[PDB]
């Protein structure tokens, strides 16, 4: 890579790895549209397997960006509308608190306090129905944002109903395949297990556990190469040949709600660029990212703004990931690690690198 990129990436990531004691890491910087890869350490400590450009990492909540885009694609296909009430797709949700909660509320965590996690006892579809029927909102719909896997997770599940495809089939055929993300998976196949890194939590090798709506909220695994391609696709949706997917990507970056300096998209979150780094580095900390925040509706939503810092953080028990890009500058970065480490450290590093590249 150009020495400038090499130096800023190495001078930023090396210290990070040492300070956070990250076992393995892969980074992709997209510059002027082209990707540059970097890898360090181990994908599997016990078996001494190094991280490579083919290593699969658990994306955790970065998976929500795929869910948001698949939803946008369904909207573009005319299969669903964000203004549709949730009950249109799950008639069994007859409890009165659901009157007024639309797919937009689910996709943007504004339904009124749906919980962060779907309880572990929820297995079956009937367990899931019971959970949503019995849930009592703390707030009226569209008034407060509370980051929640049970919110966007239900959005993902309902968004694919009309297609008659399973969430996984829809994601593979409508998003992964068209974008040639051939090493991106919701369920890692046996043939690819050789590439699946282990996550590390308190020194122990771990993988994410199965859970209700896991695919929709935090279940994607991918390589640094496929994630770089995912960033390029979101940076330049007009290059995408499949019409509804090009549109879906744009809808995922539309600004639906504003809370402080942040705007909520579908999966993606955005801020105006140039951004105040303290506004995002600090904002990333679960202290602010997962807090209850009043939201102002953007009526109507603002179409994707090129001068934006677009990003998403994600973690599983053993992995920490981060993606950020600036359309206007054709610049982006992906940081994948097999240790969940503080969000602020991720954002600080990404900002240092991207700011240095203009």
UniProtKB/Swiss-Prot annotation:
Inhibited by the beta-lactamase-blocking agents avibactam, enmetazobactam, relebactam, nacubactam, vaborbactam, taniborbactam, zidebactam, and beta-lactam-analog boronic acids, via a covalent binding to Ser-61. Inhibited by non-beta-lactam, benzo(b)thiophene-2-boronic acid (BZBTH2B) and various cyclic boronates. Not inhibited by clavulanic acid. Inhibited by O-aryloxycarbonyl hydroxamates, via cross-linking of the active site Ser-61 to Lys-312. Weakly inhibited by citric acid. Changing residue 64 to R: Lowers activity more than 2000-fold. Changing residue 147 to E: Lowers activity more than 1000-fold. InterPro entries: Bact_CellWall_Synth/Modif, Beta-lactam-related, Beta-lactam/transpept-like, Beta-lactam_class-C_AS. GO terms for molecular function: beta-lactamase activity. Its EC number is 3.5.2.6. GO terms for biological process: antibiotic catabolic process; response to antibiotic. Pfam families: Beta-lactamase. Belongs to the class-C beta-lactamase family. Class C beta-lactamase which confers resistance to penicillins and cephalosporins. Has benzylpenicillin- and cephaloridine-hydrolyzing activity. Has weak cefuroxime, cefotaxime, cefoxitin and oxacillin-hydrolyzing activities. This is Beta-lactamase. It comes from Escherichia coli (strain K12).
């Amino acid at each position: 890579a150009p020495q400038q990129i090499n130096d800023i990436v190495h001078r930023t990531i090396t210290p990070l790895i040492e300070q956070q004691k990250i076992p393995g890491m892969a980074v992709a910087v997209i510059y002027q549209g082209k990707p540059y890869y970097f890898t360090w350490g181990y994908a599997d400590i016990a078996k001494k397997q190094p991280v490579t450009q083919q290593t699969l990492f658990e994306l955790g909540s970065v998976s929500k960006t795929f869910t948001g885009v698949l939803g946008g694609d369904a909207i573009a296909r005319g299969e669903i509308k964000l203004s549709d009430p949730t009950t249109k797709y799950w008639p069994e949700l007859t409890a009165k608190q659901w009157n007024g909660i639309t797919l937009l509320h689910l996709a943007t965590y504004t339904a009124g306090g749906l919980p962060l996690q779907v309880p572990d006892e929820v297995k079956s579809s009937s367990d899931l129905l019971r959970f949503y029927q019995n849930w009592q909102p703390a707030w009226a719909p569209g008034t407060q944002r509370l980051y929640a896997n049970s919110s966007i997770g239900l959005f993902g599940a309902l968004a694919v109903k009309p297609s008659g495809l399973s969430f996984e089939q829809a994601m593979q055929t409508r998003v992964f395949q068209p974008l040639k993300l051939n090493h991106t998976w919701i369920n890692v196949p046996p043939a690819e297990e050789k590439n699946y890194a282990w996550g590390y939590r308190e020194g122990k090798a771990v993988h994410v556990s199965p859970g209700a709506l896991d695919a929709e909220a935090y279940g994607v695994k991918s390589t640094i190469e496929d994630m770089a391609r995912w960033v390029q696709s979101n940076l330049k949706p007009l290059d995408i040949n499949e019409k509804t997917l090009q549109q879906g990507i744009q809808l995922a970056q539309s600004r639906y709600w504003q809370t402080g300096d942040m705007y909520q998209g579908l999966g993606w979150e955005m801020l105006d660029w140039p951004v105040n780094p303290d506004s995002i580095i600090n904002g990333s900390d679960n202290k602010i990212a997962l807090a209850a925040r009043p939201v102002k509706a953007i009526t109507p939503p603002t179409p994707a703004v090129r001068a934006s810092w677009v990003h998403k953080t994600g973690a599983t028990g053993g992995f920490g990931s981060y993606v950020a890009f600036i359309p206007e500058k054709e610049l982006g970065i992906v940081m994948l690690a097999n240790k969940n480490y503080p969000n602020p450290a991720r954002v600080d590093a990404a900002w240092q690198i991207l700011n240095a590249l203009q």
